[PDB]
Amino acid sequence: MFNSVLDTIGNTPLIRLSKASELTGCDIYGKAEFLNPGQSVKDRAALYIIRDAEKRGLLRPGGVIVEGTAGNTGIGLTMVAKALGYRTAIVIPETASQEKKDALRLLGAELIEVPAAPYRNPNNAVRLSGRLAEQLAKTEPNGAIWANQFDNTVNRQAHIETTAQEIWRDTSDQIDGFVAAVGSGGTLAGTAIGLKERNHNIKIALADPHGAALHAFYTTGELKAEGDSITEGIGQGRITANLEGFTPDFSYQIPDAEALDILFALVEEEGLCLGGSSGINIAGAIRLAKDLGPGHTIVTVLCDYGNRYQSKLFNPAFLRGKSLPVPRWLE
Beta carbon of residue 199, minimum distance to a second copy (angstroms, whole number): 17
User: Please, is 3 exposed, middle or buried when counting C-beta atoms within 10 Å of its C-beta (0-12, 13-18, 19+)?
Assistant: exposed
* Residue among 182 and 282 whose Cβ is closer to a second copy: 282
The residue (of 171 and 251) whose beta carbon lies closer to a second copy is 171
User: What is the set of active-site residues?
Assistant: 42
Which CA distances in Å does 258 have to 209, 253, 324?
10, 10, 10
Element (H, E) at 166: helix 164-170
- What is the contact surface with a second copy in residues (CB under 8 A)? 1-8, 13-16, 18, 27, 29, 32, 34-35, 37, 39, 78-84, 102-103, 105-108, 170-172, 267-273, 305-307, 310, 314, 327, 329-330
Supply the minimum distance, in Å, between the C-beta of residue 31 and a second copy.
11
Task: Supply φ then ψ for residue 269, to 5 degrees.
Answer: -105, -25
Residue length of the chain: 331
Cα–Cα distance, 295 to 301 (Å, whole number): 20
CA-based nearest residue to 65, from 120, 143, 155: 143
Cβ-Cβ contacts under 8 Å for 95 (sequence gap 6 or more): 115, 116
